[PDB]
Amino acid sequence: VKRPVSASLARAFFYIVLLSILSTGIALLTLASSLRDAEAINIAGSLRMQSYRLGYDLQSGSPQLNAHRQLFQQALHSPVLTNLNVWYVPEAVKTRYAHLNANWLEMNNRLSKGDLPWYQANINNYVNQIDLFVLALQHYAERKMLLVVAISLAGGIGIFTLVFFTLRRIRHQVVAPLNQLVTASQRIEHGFPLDTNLPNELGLLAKTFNQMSSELHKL
Amino acid sequence: VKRPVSASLARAFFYIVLLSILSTGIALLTLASSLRDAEAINIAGSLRMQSYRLGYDLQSGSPQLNAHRQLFQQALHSPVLTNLNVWYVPEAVKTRYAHLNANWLEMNNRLSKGDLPWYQANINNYVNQIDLFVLALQHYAERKMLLVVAISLAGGIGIFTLVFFTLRRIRHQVVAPLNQLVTASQRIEHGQFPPLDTNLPNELGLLAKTFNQMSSELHKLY
């Protein structure tokens, strides 16, 4: 016994089941992690409208300006947006977010100084930076949906392939010999050739069979 | 015989393979049905900003007012938002969207007449309506995603349970009895002659029987 069927199949079943739970599980993780994407885009997007609302408050001399500045700070630091500071989120997203933070520091100050000229000069570029942040969240959302197809489809192909060759091996090193042992057996049960060369358990069974059978024919 | 060892080994692979087909299938129609949720929400949301920018344009007497009025119409009628008026999309979304169209008509009108007093009195409610439309889309996207997670996780565990049990049946009906046959076969090599389990509905049962007989008669004649 230099190659048991126990180890071979177990081995093959371990690697196949493994990557089936890896590919399948990673895909689910990725879907699950997308549950808060629509919220992040919504909140991230609202920062655009709020930025303009602030300029509108400023231009009108609205008493709401200070409250609205507070709301912007609040929404910019929403749980959903602060959560993006994780390893598995693209650095681009995290980078842009940091940039929105520094921009806001200045914008908030200029607003409090009632500096409308600065605002008029800078608002368009300010809001564009936010808009490119929201665009990056959008792309990141799409990326995840595509990765799930990739992982499922690619892992899938990888599984078919491993299963194709494992099934072919089993057809050849388990089933074929078994059929030979079954024929021989039924023929013996009426009144005395196999694969005794196999390096596995079936090779051995056919060796002993050949022995026990051959001696009977002689007797 | 009833369950060829082949069939038992094939079924365990069949369930794993089927998991992958379903897994890609589900991912594909998730993609087909939801790849643009994020664009929809981004654009839907952007209408909120554009409404305030227009106000901002109005108050400044900006020459960009008309160009920006056009952008809103254009953004309001993006393919992604127009392709929402469909059976699969909750009536909530579709209703709120229609509301937005009616509102934009008057709002566009008041902008061109340069009616700032009206803008000031109505903008906050105007933008709240858009905001609720965006919220409708958001919840619609989350429900779909949540549904897909639940179904996938259900189907995954459903199928992996069958694989688990098929894989257990193989350790009992196949691997274990092979180890018996291997031990019995080894003793015979040295003329040793208990009986093997013949209960199995597979080829190992059939072989156990003939193995049992040939060995029992040898011990008597020998």
Side-chain angles (χ1 to χ4, degrees), chain A residues 127-142 144-168 170 172-175:
Chain A
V127 168
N128 179 63
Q129 279 165 86
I130 300 183
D131 194 71
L132 293 194
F133 174 68
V134 176
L135 189 59
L137 287 175
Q138 183 188 313
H139 289 334
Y140 179 51
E142 294 159 356
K144 292 199 283 190
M145 222 147 285
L146 295 160
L147 266 164
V148 176
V149 177
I151 289 172
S152 300
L153 188 161
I157 273 58
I159 279 110
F160 297 161
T161 310
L162 293 184
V163 174
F164 179 86
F165 288 95
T166 296
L167 271 196
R168 159 176 258 257
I170 290 169
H172 290 158
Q173 289 179 334
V174 170
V175 172

mmCIF file of all heavy atoms in Angstrom, chain A residues 127-175, unseen atoms left out:
data_model
loop_
_atom_site.group_PDB
_atom_site.id
_atom_site.type_symbol
_atom_site.label_atom_id
_atom_site.label_comp_id
_atom_site.label_asym_id
_atom_site.label_seq_id
_atom_site.Cartn_x
_atom_site.Cartn_y
_atom_site.Cartn_z
ATOM 1 N N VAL A 127 -17.038 71.403 -3.900
ATOM 2 C CA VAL A 127 -18.099 70.421 -4.072
ATOM 3 C C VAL A 127 -17.693 69.347 -5.058
ATOM 4 O O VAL A 127 -18.151 68.217 -4.965
ATOM 5 C CB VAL A 127 -19.421 71.069 -4.484
ATOM 6 C CG1 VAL A 127 -20.423 70.007 -4.934
ATOM 7 C CG2 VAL A 127 -19.975 71.868 -3.308
ATOM 8 N N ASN A 128 -16.810 69.683 -5.988
ATOM 9 C CA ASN A 128 -16.298 68.687 -6.907
ATOM 10 C C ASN A 128 -15.468 67.627 -6.189
ATOM 11 O O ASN A 128 -15.554 66.451 -6.516
ATOM 12 C CB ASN A 128 -15.466 69.335 -8.009
ATOM 13 C CG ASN A 128 -14.900 68.306 -8.974
ATOM 14 O OD1 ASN A 128 -15.651 67.600 -9.656
ATOM 15 N ND2 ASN A 128 -13.574 68.192 -9.014
ATOM 16 N N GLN A 129 -14.653 68.035 -5.222
ATOM 17 C CA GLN A 129 -13.915 67.062 -4.417
ATOM 18 C C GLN A 129 -14.860 66.093 -3.684
ATOM 19 O O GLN A 129 -14.619 64.892 -3.637
ATOM 20 C CB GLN A 129 -12.984 67.772 -3.437
ATOM 21 C CG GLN A 129 -11.687 68.202 -4.093
ATOM 22 C CD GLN A 129 -10.907 69.202 -3.264
ATOM 23 O OE1 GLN A 129 -10.124 68.827 -2.380
ATOM 24 N NE2 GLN A 129 -11.102 70.488 -3.557
ATOM 25 N N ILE A 130 -15.954 66.602 -3.136
ATOM 26 C CA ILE A 130 -16.948 65.736 -2.524
ATOM 27 C C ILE A 130 -17.547 64.814 -3.575
ATOM 28 O O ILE A 130 -17.707 63.604 -3.357
ATOM 29 C CB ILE A 130 -18.072 66.550 -1.860
ATOM 30 C CG1 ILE A 130 -17.492 67.448 -0.771
ATOM 31 C CG2 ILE A 130 -19.117 65.625 -1.267
ATOM 32 C CD1 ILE A 130 -18.529 68.242 -0.012
ATOM 33 N N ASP A 131 -17.866 65.380 -4.729
ATOM 34 C CA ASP A 131 -18.496 64.616 -5.785
ATOM 35 C C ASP A 131 -17.604 63.494 -6.320
ATOM 36 O O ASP A 131 -18.097 62.440 -6.736
ATOM 37 C CB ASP A 131 -18.903 65.543 -6.920
ATOM 38 C CG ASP A 131 -19.851 64.884 -7.892
ATOM 39 O OD1 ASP A 131 -21.025 64.648 -7.532
ATOM 40 O OD2 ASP A 131 -19.406 64.606 -9.023
ATOM 41 N N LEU A 132 -16.293 63.706 -6.311
ATOM 42 C CA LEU A 132 -15.361 62.639 -6.687
ATOM 43 C C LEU A 132 -15.207 61.591 -5.588
ATOM 44 O O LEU A 132 -14.919 60.422 -5.870
ATOM 45 C CB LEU A 132 -14.008 63.220 -7.076
ATOM 46 C CG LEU A 132 -14.059 64.053 -8.367
ATOM 47 C CD1 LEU A 132 -12.654 64.309 -8.876
ATOM 48 C CD2 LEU A 132 -14.885 63.386 -9.457
ATOM 49 N N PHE A 133 -15.410 61.996 -4.339
ATOM 50 C CA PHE A 133 -15.514 61.037 -3.232
ATOM 51 C C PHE A 133 -16.757 60.144 -3.392
ATOM 52 O O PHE A 133 -16.682 58.917 -3.241
ATOM 53 C CB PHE A 133 -15.546 61.787 -1.905
ATOM 54 C CG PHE A 133 -15.788 60.921 -0.711
ATOM 55 C CD1 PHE A 133 -14.842 59.995 -0.302
ATOM 56 C CD2 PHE A 133 -16.951 61.060 0.034
ATOM 57 C CE1 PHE A 133 -15.057 59.211 0.818
ATOM 58 C CE2 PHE A 133 -17.177 60.274 1.158
ATOM 59 C CZ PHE A 133 -16.225 59.350 1.549
ATOM 60 N N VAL A 134 -17.892 60.747 -3.727
ATOM 61 C CA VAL A 134 -19.119 59.977 -3.902
ATOM 62 C C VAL A 134 -18.995 59.059 -5.114
ATOM 63 O O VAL A 134 -19.477 57.923 -5.093
ATOM 64 C CB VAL A 134 -20.363 60.887 -4.037
ATOM 65 C CG1 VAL A 134 -21.613 60.075 -4.319
ATOM 66 C CG2 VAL A 134 -20.552 61.695 -2.768
ATOM 67 N N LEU A 135 -18.336 59.548 -6.164
ATOM 68 C CA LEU A 135 -18.066 58.730 -7.352
ATOM 69 C C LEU A 135 -17.203 57.518 -7.015
ATOM 70 O O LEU A 135 -17.455 56.419 -7.520
ATOM 71 C CB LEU A 135 -17.386 59.549 -8.449
ATOM 72 C CG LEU A 135 -17.285 58.817 -9.797
ATOM 73 C CD1 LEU A 135 -18.678 58.450 -10.299
ATOM 74 C CD2 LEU A 135 -16.536 59.628 -10.854
ATOM 75 N N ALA A 136 -16.196 57.713 -6.159
ATOM 76 C CA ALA A 136 -15.331 56.615 -5.726
ATOM 77 C C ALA A 136 -16.071 55.585 -4.859
ATOM 78 O O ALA A 136 -15.828 54.382 -4.983
ATOM 79 C CB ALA A 136 -14.128 57.153 -4.984
ATOM 80 N N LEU A 137 -16.958 56.050 -3.980
ATOM 81 C CA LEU A 137 -17.845 55.146 -3.241
ATOM 82 C C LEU A 137 -18.729 54.363 -4.199
ATOM 83 O O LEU A 137 -18.937 53.165 -4.008
ATOM 84 C CB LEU A 137 -18.743 55.912 -2.272
ATOM 85 C CG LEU A 137 -18.098 56.476 -1.012
ATOM 86 C CD1 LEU A 137 -19.120 57.298 -0.243
ATOM 87 C CD2 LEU A 137 -17.541 55.357 -0.157
ATOM 88 N N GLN A 138 -19.262 55.044 -5.217
ATOM 89 C CA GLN A 138 -20.060 54.383 -6.236
ATOM 90 C C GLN A 138 -19.274 53.269 -6.909
ATOM 91 O O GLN A 138 -19.777 52.158 -7.080
ATOM 92 C CB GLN A 138 -20.496 55.387 -7.298
ATOM 93 C CG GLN A 138 -21.405 54.792 -8.356
ATOM 94 C CD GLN A 138 -21.681 55.736 -9.511
ATOM 95 O OE1 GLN A 138 -22.001 56.915 -9.317
ATOM 96 N NE2 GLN A 138 -21.575 55.218 -10.722
ATOM 97 N N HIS A 139 -18.044 53.571 -7.317
ATOM 98 C CA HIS A 139 -17.228 52.593 -8.014
ATOM 99 C C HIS A 139 -16.876 51.440 -7.093
ATOM 100 O O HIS A 139 -16.841 50.280 -7.518
ATOM 101 C CB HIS A 139 -15.933 53.223 -8.543
ATOM 102 C CG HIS A 139 -16.142 54.156 -9.693
ATOM 103 N ND1 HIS A 139 -17.215 54.052 -10.550
ATOM 104 C CD2 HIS A 139 -15.416 55.210 -10.127
ATOM 105 C CE1 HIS A 139 -17.142 55.005 -11.463
ATOM 106 N NE2 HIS A 139 -16.058 55.718 -11.230
ATOM 107 N N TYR A 140 -16.596 51.764 -5.836
ATOM 108 C CA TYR A 140 -16.296 50.743 -4.842
ATOM 109 C C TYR A 140 -17.511 49.827 -4.627
ATOM 110 O O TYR A 140 -17.375 48.612 -4.529
ATOM 111 C CB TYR A 140 -15.842 51.409 -3.544
ATOM 112 C CG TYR A 140 -15.529 50.460 -2.420
ATOM 113 C CD1 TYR A 140 -14.678 49.378 -2.606
ATOM 114 C CD2 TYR A 140 -16.066 50.662 -1.161
ATOM 115 C CE1 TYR A 140 -14.390 48.512 -1.566
ATOM 116 C CE2 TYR A 140 -15.783 49.806 -0.116
ATOM 117 C CZ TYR A 140 -14.949 48.734 -0.319
ATOM 118 O OH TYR A 140 -14.684 47.893 0.738
ATOM 119 N N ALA A 141 -18.705 50.404 -4.594
ATOM 120 C CA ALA A 141 -19.918 49.603 -4.530
ATOM 121 C C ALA A 141 -19.985 48.664 -5.728
ATOM 122 O O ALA A 141 -20.260 47.486 -5.578
ATOM 123 C CB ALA A 141 -21.145 50.497 -4.496
ATOM 124 N N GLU A 142 -19.740 49.181 -6.922
ATOM 125 C CA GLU A 142 -19.830 48.352 -8.125
ATOM 126 C C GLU A 142 -18.748 47.273 -8.135
ATOM 127 O O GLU A 142 -19.013 46.118 -8.446
ATOM 128 C CB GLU A 142 -19.735 49.217 -9.381
ATOM 129 C CG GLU A 142 -20.918 50.154 -9.539
ATOM 130 C CD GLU A 142 -20.625 51.330 -10.447
ATOM 131 O OE1 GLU A 142 -19.469 51.469 -10.910
ATOM 132 O OE2 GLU A 142 -21.565 52.118 -10.698
ATOM 133 N N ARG A 143 -17.534 47.663 -7.782
ATOM 134 C CA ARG A 143 -16.436 46.734 -7.689
ATOM 135 C C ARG A 143 -16.856 45.488 -6.919
ATOM 136 O O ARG A 143 -16.571 44.367 -7.334
ATOM 137 C CB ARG A 143 -15.248 47.398 -6.985
ATOM 138 C CG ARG A 143 -13.938 46.630 -7.111
ATOM 139 C CD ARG A 143 -12.974 46.950 -5.978
ATOM 140 N N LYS A 144 -17.535 45.682 -5.796
ATOM 141 C CA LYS A 144 -17.850 44.564 -4.903
ATOM 142 C C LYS A 144 -18.830 43.607 -5.544
ATOM 143 O O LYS A 144 -18.699 42.390 -5.425
ATOM 144 C CB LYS A 144 -18.369 45.075 -3.558
ATOM 145 C CG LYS A 144 -17.279 45.784 -2.765
ATOM 146 C CD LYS A 144 -17.589 45.894 -1.283
ATOM 147 C CE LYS A 144 -18.596 46.993 -0.998
ATOM 148 N NZ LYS A 144 -18.705 47.243 0.464
ATOM 149 N N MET A 145 -19.799 44.157 -6.253
ATOM 150 C CA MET A 145 -20.767 43.344 -6.962
ATOM 151 C C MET A 145 -20.077 42.514 -8.044
ATOM 152 O O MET A 145 -20.473 41.383 -8.327
ATOM 153 C CB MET A 145 -21.813 44.249 -7.588
ATOM 154 C CG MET A 145 -23.234 43.746 -7.471
ATOM 155 S SD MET A 145 -24.353 45.147 -7.306
ATOM 156 C CE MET A 145 -24.035 45.629 -5.613
ATOM 157 N N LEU A 146 -19.036 43.079 -8.646
ATOM 158 C CA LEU A 146 -18.318 42.404 -9.723
ATOM 159 C C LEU A 146 -17.373 41.357 -9.168
ATOM 160 O O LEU A 146 -17.242 40.284 -9.729
ATOM 161 C CB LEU A 146 -17.546 43.421 -10.565
ATOM 162 C CG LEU A 146 -18.423 44.418 -11.328
ATOM 163 C CD1 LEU A 146 -17.614 45.641 -11.727
ATOM 164 C CD2 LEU A 146 -19.072 43.776 -12.546
ATOM 165 N N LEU A 147 -16.712 41.671 -8.063
ATOM 166 C CA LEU A 147 -15.851 40.711 -7.392
ATOM 167 C C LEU A 147 -16.618 39.448 -7.008
ATOM 168 O O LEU A 147 -16.091 38.346 -7.108
ATOM 169 C CB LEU A 147 -15.231 41.328 -6.137
ATOM 170 C CG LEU A 147 -13.845 41.947 -6.303
ATOM 171 C CD1 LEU A 147 -13.520 42.848 -5.125
ATOM 172 C CD2 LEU A 147 -12.792 40.859 -6.455
ATOM 173 N N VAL A 148 -17.857 39.608 -6.566
ATOM 174 C CA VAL A 148 -18.664 38.461 -6.165
ATOM 175 C C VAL A 148 -18.907 37.542 -7.357
ATOM 176 O O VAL A 148 -18.895 36.326 -7.215
ATOM 177 C CB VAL A 148 -20.012 38.891 -5.545
ATOM 178 C CG1 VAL A 148 -20.871 37.685 -5.239
ATOM 179 C CG2 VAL A 148 -19.788 39.679 -4.273
ATOM 180 N N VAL A 149 -19.137 38.120 -8.529
ATOM 181 C CA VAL A 149 -19.282 37.326 -9.745
ATOM 182 C C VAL A 149 -17.944 36.680 -10.092
ATOM 183 O O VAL A 149 -17.866 35.484 -10.345
ATOM 184 C CB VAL A 149 -19.746 38.180 -10.937
ATOM 185 C CG1 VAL A 149 -19.814 37.338 -12.200
ATOM 186 C CG2 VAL A 149 -21.101 38.789 -10.646
ATOM 187 N N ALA A 150 -16.886 37.476 -10.093
ATOM 188 C CA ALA A 150 -15.558 36.953 -10.356
ATOM 189 C C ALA A 150 -15.224 35.757 -9.452
ATOM 190 O O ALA A 150 -14.856 34.693 -9.925
ATOM 191 C CB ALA A 150 -14.522 38.054 -10.177
ATOM 192 N N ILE A 151 -15.339 35.940 -8.148
ATOM 193 C CA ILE A 151 -14.949 34.902 -7.203
ATOM 194 C C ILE A 151 -15.817 33.660 -7.358
ATOM 195 O O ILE A 151 -15.342 32.540 -7.266
ATOM 196 C CB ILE A 151 -15.057 35.410 -5.755
ATOM 197 C CG1 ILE A 151 -13.953 36.438 -5.476
ATOM 198 C CG2 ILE A 151 -14.966 34.247 -4.780
ATOM 199 C CD1 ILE A 151 -14.078 37.139 -4.137
ATOM 200 N N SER A 152 -17.102 33.862 -7.581
ATOM 201 C CA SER A 152 -18.010 32.749 -7.688
ATOM 202 C C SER A 152 -17.726 31.976 -8.968
ATOM 203 O O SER A 152 -17.635 30.744 -8.975
ATOM 204 C CB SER A 152 -19.435 33.274 -7.676
ATOM 205 O OG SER A 152 -19.655 33.960 -6.460
ATOM 206 N N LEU A 153 -17.574 32.727 -10.047
ATOM 207 C CA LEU A 153 -17.370 32.178 -11.373
ATOM 208 C C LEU A 153 -15.989 31.543 -11.513
ATOM 209 O O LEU A 153 -15.853 30.469 -12.089
ATOM 210 C CB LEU A 153 -17.549 33.308 -12.386
ATOM 211 C CG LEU A 153 -17.576 33.013 -13.879
ATOM 212 C CD1 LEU A 153 -18.225 34.192 -14.587
ATOM 213 C CD2 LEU A 153 -16.173 32.783 -14.411
ATOM 214 N N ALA A 154 -14.971 32.202 -10.973
ATOM 215 C CA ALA A 154 -13.598 31.726 -11.099
ATOM 216 C C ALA A 154 -13.345 30.562 -10.162
ATOM 217 O O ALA A 154 -12.786 29.544 -10.556
ATOM 218 C CB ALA A 154 -12.622 32.848 -10.819
ATOM 219 N N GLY A 155 -13.745 30.708 -8.912
ATOM 220 C CA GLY A 155 -13.704 29.583 -7.990
ATOM 221 C C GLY A 155 -14.483 28.413 -8.563
ATOM 222 O O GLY A 155 -14.033 27.273 -8.502
ATOM 223 N N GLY A 156 -15.653 28.700 -9.130
ATOM 224 C CA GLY A 156 -16.479 27.676 -9.738
ATOM 225 C C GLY A 156 -15.712 26.868 -10.764
ATOM 226 O O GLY A 156 -15.650 25.636 -10.691
ATOM 227 N N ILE A 157 -15.120 27.562 -11.727
ATOM 228 C CA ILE A 157 -14.338 26.919 -12.769
ATOM 229 C C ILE A 157 -13.242 26.068 -12.149
ATOM 230 O O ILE A 157 -13.047 24.915 -12.528
ATOM 231 C CB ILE A 157 -13.735 27.967 -13.724
ATOM 232 C CG1 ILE A 157 -14.730 28.295 -14.847
ATOM 233 C CG2 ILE A 157 -12.438 27.470 -14.343
ATOM 234 C CD1 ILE A 157 -16.073 28.804 -14.367
ATOM 235 N N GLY A 158 -12.533 26.641 -11.187
ATOM 236 C CA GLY A 158 -11.515 25.913 -10.432
ATOM 237 C C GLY A 158 -12.067 24.651 -9.791
ATOM 238 O O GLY A 158 -11.404 23.618 -9.763
ATOM 239 N N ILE A 159 -13.286 24.726 -9.271
ATOM 240 C CA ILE A 159 -13.922 23.557 -8.689
ATOM 241 C C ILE A 159 -14.277 22.534 -9.766
ATOM 242 O O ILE A 159 -13.972 21.360 -9.603
ATOM 243 C CB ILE A 159 -15.178 23.911 -7.851
ATOM 244 C CG1 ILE A 159 -14.786 24.382 -6.452
ATOM 245 C CG2 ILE A 159 -16.093 22.708 -7.695
ATOM 246 C CD1 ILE A 159 -15.035 25.855 -6.213
ATOM 247 N N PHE A 160 -14.916 22.954 -10.857
ATOM 248 C CA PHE A 160 -15.262 21.987 -11.906
ATOM 249 C C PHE A 160 -13.998 21.233 -12.296
ATOM 250 O O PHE A 160 -14.002 20.011 -12.403
ATOM 251 C CB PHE A 160 -15.848 22.631 -13.176
ATOM 252 C CG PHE A 160 -17.153 23.357 -12.977
ATOM 253 C CD1 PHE A 160 -17.579 24.285 -13.921
ATOM 254 C CD2 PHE A 160 -17.966 23.104 -11.884
ATOM 255 C CE1 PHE A 160 -18.778 24.961 -13.770
ATOM 256 C CE2 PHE A 160 -19.168 23.784 -11.725
ATOM 257 C CZ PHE A 160 -19.573 24.712 -12.669
ATOM 258 N N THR A 161 -12.908 21.967 -12.499
ATOM 259 C CA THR A 161 -11.675 21.357 -12.976
ATOM 260 C C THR A 161 -11.172 20.290 -11.999
ATOM 261 O O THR A 161 -10.918 19.153 -12.397
ATOM 262 C CB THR A 161 -10.579 22.416 -13.233
ATOM 263 O OG1 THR A 161 -11.115 23.467 -14.040
ATOM 264 C CG2 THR A 161 -9.394 21.804 -13.954
ATOM 265 N N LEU A 162 -11.032 20.652 -10.726
ATOM 266 C CA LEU A 162 -10.579 19.699 -9.720
ATOM 267 C C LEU A 162 -11.521 18.508 -9.638
ATOM 268 O O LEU A 162 -11.083 17.371 -9.451
ATOM 269 C CB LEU A 162 -10.479 20.351 -8.348
ATOM 270 C CG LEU A 162 -9.409 21.423 -8.157
ATOM 271 C CD1 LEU A 162 -9.413 21.866 -6.699
ATOM 272 C CD2 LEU A 162 -8.029 20.927 -8.563
ATOM 273 N N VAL A 163 -12.818 18.764 -9.776
ATOM 274 C CA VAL A 163 -13.806 17.697 -9.696
ATOM 275 C C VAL A 163 -13.742 16.814 -10.950
ATOM 276 O O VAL A 163 -13.909 15.592 -10.884
ATOM 277 C CB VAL A 163 -15.226 18.260 -9.495
ATOM 278 C CG1 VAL A 163 -16.261 17.145 -9.553
ATOM 279 C CG2 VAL A 163 -15.319 18.990 -8.164
ATOM 280 N N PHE A 164 -13.482 17.423 -12.095
ATOM 281 C CA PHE A 164 -13.337 16.648 -13.318
ATOM 282 C C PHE A 164 -12.220 15.614 -13.165
ATOM 283 O O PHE A 164 -12.408 14.427 -13.448
ATOM 284 C CB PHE A 164 -13.036 17.557 -14.503
ATOM 285 C CG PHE A 164 -12.843 16.812 -15.780
ATOM 286 C CD1 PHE A 164 -13.929 16.481 -16.574
ATOM 287 C CD2 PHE A 164 -11.578 16.414 -16.175
ATOM 288 C CE1 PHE A 164 -13.755 15.770 -17.748
ATOM 289 C CE2 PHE A 164 -11.397 15.706 -17.348
ATOM 290 C CZ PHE A 164 -12.486 15.383 -18.137
ATOM 291 N N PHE A 165 -11.058 16.054 -12.698
ATOM 292 C CA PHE A 165 -9.923 15.149 -12.623
ATOM 293 C C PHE A 165 -10.030 14.158 -11.477
ATOM 294 O O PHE A 165 -9.584 13.017 -11.601
ATOM 295 C CB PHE A 165 -8.601 15.930 -12.600
ATOM 296 C CG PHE A 165 -8.257 16.545 -13.931
ATOM 297 C CD1 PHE A 165 -8.590 17.856 -14.214
ATOM 298 C CD2 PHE A 165 -7.647 15.792 -14.916
ATOM 299 C CE1 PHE A 165 -8.296 18.411 -15.450
ATOM 300 C CE2 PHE A 165 -7.344 16.342 -16.152
ATOM 301 C CZ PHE A 165 -7.667 17.653 -16.416
ATOM 302 N N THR A 166 -10.632 14.572 -10.368
ATOM 303 C CA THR A 166 -10.867 13.661 -9.256
ATOM 304 C C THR A 166 -11.845 12.573 -9.670
ATOM 305 O O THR A 166 -11.636 11.403 -9.373
ATOM 306 C CB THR A 166 -11.414 14.394 -8.024
ATOM 307 O OG1 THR A 166 -10.428 15.315 -7.548
ATOM 308 C CG2 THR A 166 -11.749 13.404 -6.909
ATOM 309 N N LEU A 167 -12.902 12.946 -10.378
ATOM 310 C CA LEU A 167 -13.859 11.954 -10.855
ATOM 311 C C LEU A 167 -13.238 10.987 -11.842
ATOM 312 O O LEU A 167 -13.574 9.801 -11.849
ATOM 313 C CB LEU A 167 -15.078 12.618 -11.487
ATOM 314 C CG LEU A 167 -16.211 12.924 -10.507
ATOM 315 C CD1 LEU A 167 -17.507 13.195 -11.268
ATOM 316 C CD2 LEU A 167 -16.391 11.773 -9.518
ATOM 317 N N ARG A 168 -12.344 11.487 -12.689
ATOM 318 C CA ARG A 168 -11.672 10.635 -13.673
ATOM 319 C C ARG A 168 -10.740 9.635 -12.972
ATOM 320 O O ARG A 168 -10.725 8.453 -13.299
ATOM 321 C CB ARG A 168 -10.915 11.487 -14.681
ATOM 322 C CG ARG A 168 -9.810 10.744 -15.403
ATOM 323 C CD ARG A 168 -9.165 11.620 -16.464
ATOM 324 N NE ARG A 168 -9.641 11.282 -17.796
ATOM 325 C CZ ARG A 168 -8.942 10.584 -18.674
ATOM 326 N NH1 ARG A 168 -7.724 10.156 -18.362
ATOM 327 N NH2 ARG A 168 -9.459 10.321 -19.866
ATOM 328 N N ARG A 169 -9.993 10.113 -11.986
ATOM 329 C CA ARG A 169 -9.174 9.242 -11.154
ATOM 330 C C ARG A 169 -10.006 8.146 -10.477
ATOM 331 O O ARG A 169 -9.625 6.978 -10.483
ATOM 332 C CB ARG A 169 -8.450 10.073 -10.094
ATOM 333 C CG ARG A 169 -7.352 9.330 -9.359
ATOM 334 C CD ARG A 169 -6.430 10.296 -8.630
ATOM 335 N NE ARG A 169 -7.120 11.005 -7.558
ATOM 336 N N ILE A 170 -11.142 8.523 -9.898
ATOM 337 C CA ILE A 170 -12.012 7.563 -9.219
ATOM 338 C C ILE A 170 -12.581 6.519 -10.188
ATOM 339 O O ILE A 170 -12.653 5.336 -9.871
ATOM 340 C CB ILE A 170 -13.176 8.281 -8.506
ATOM 341 C CG1 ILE A 170 -12.653 9.059 -7.302
ATOM 342 C CG2 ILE A 170 -14.230 7.286 -8.045
ATOM 343 C CD1 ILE A 170 -13.671 10.006 -6.704
ATOM 344 N N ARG A 171 -13.003 6.969 -11.360
ATOM 345 C CA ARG A 171 -13.455 6.076 -12.423
ATOM 346 C C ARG A 171 -12.391 5.019 -12.722
ATOM 347 O O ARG A 171 -12.712 3.858 -12.978
ATOM 348 C CB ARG A 171 -13.734 6.893 -13.692
ATOM 349 C CG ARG A 171 -14.636 6.224 -14.715
ATOM 350 C CD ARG A 171 -14.240 6.572 -16.156
ATOM 351 N NE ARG A 171 -14.373 7.993 -16.489
ATOM 352 N N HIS A 172 -11.123 5.420 -12.664
ATOM 353 C CA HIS A 172 -10.015 4.570 -13.113
ATOM 354 C C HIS A 172 -9.357 3.731 -12.023
ATOM 355 O O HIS A 172 -8.884 2.623 -12.288
ATOM 356 C CB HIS A 172 -8.935 5.424 -13.780
ATOM 357 C CG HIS A 172 -9.348 5.987 -15.101
ATOM 358 N ND1 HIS A 172 -8.757 7.101 -15.654
ATOM 359 C CD2 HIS A 172 -10.301 5.591 -15.977
ATOM 360 C CE1 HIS A 172 -9.329 7.368 -16.814
ATOM 361 N NE2 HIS A 172 -10.264 6.462 -17.037
ATOM 362 N N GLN A 173 -9.304 4.258 -10.810
ATOM 363 C CA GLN A 173 -8.557 3.601 -9.754
ATOM 364 C C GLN A 173 -9.432 3.040 -8.639
ATOM 365 O O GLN A 173 -8.926 2.425 -7.695
ATOM 366 C CB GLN A 173 -7.533 4.567 -9.190
ATOM 367 C CG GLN A 173 -6.404 4.833 -10.161
ATOM 368 C CD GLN A 173 -5.394 5.811 -9.613
ATOM 369 O OE1 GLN A 173 -5.713 6.642 -8.757
ATOM 370 N NE2 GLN A 173 -4.167 5.723 -10.106
ATOM 371 N N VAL A 174 -10.737 3.243 -8.749
ATOM 372 C CA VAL A 174 -11.665 2.716 -7.759
ATOM 373 C C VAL A 174 -12.772 1.923 -8.431
ATOM 374 O O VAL A 174 -12.952 0.746 -8.151
ATOM 375 C CB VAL A 174 -12.292 3.832 -6.905
ATOM 376 C CG1 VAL A 174 -13.420 3.270 -6.053
ATOM 377 C CG2 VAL A 174 -11.234 4.495 -6.031
ATOM 378 N N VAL A 175 -13.495 2.569 -9.335
ATOM 379 C CA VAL A 175 -14.669 1.969 -9.936
ATOM 380 C C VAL A 175 -14.322 0.834 -10.887
ATOM 381 O O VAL A 175 -14.909 -0.239 -10.807
ATOM 382 C CB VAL A 175 -15.477 3.023 -10.693
ATOM 383 C CG1 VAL A 175 -16.596 2.374 -11.495
ATOM 384 C CG2 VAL A 175 -16.021 4.047 -9.710
#
